[PDB]
């Protein structure tokens, strides 16, 4: 009965979701720097 456990694996979506949620917030946070918000440009130099 314990041996069958590997067959069911070879599930962890709850662990991948944690990784995805943070990766998505970091990808969005960086992308929000390319926005003009109604200014003449988006680059302070």
């Amino acid at each position: 009965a314990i041996g069958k456990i590997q067959d069911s694996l070879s599930a962890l979506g709850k662990l991948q979701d944690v990784v995805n949620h943070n990766a998505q917030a970091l990808n969005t946070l960086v992308k929000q720097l390319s926005s003009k918000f109604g200014a003449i440009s988006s680059v302070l130099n």
């Binding site: 990808n27 960086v30 992308k31 390319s34 130099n45």
Partner: protein, 48 residues
């Protein structure tokens, strides 16, 4: 550094990328320049 207009900051190193024979500089994911070509010597340099 400044490359024919392109203004930036970083360390320049020999690259191993291959541009197409009409492209001057490259950008990475999230749209930031990460490689340029020297107009004079035609060599690809990474920007770290």
């Amino acid at each position: 550094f400044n490359f024919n207009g392109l203004k930036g900051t970083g360390v320049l190193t020999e690259s191993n990328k291959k541009f197409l024979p009409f492209q001057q500089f490259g950008r990475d994911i999230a749209d930031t320049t990460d490689a340029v070509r020297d107009p004079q010597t035609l060599e690809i340099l990474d920007i770290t």
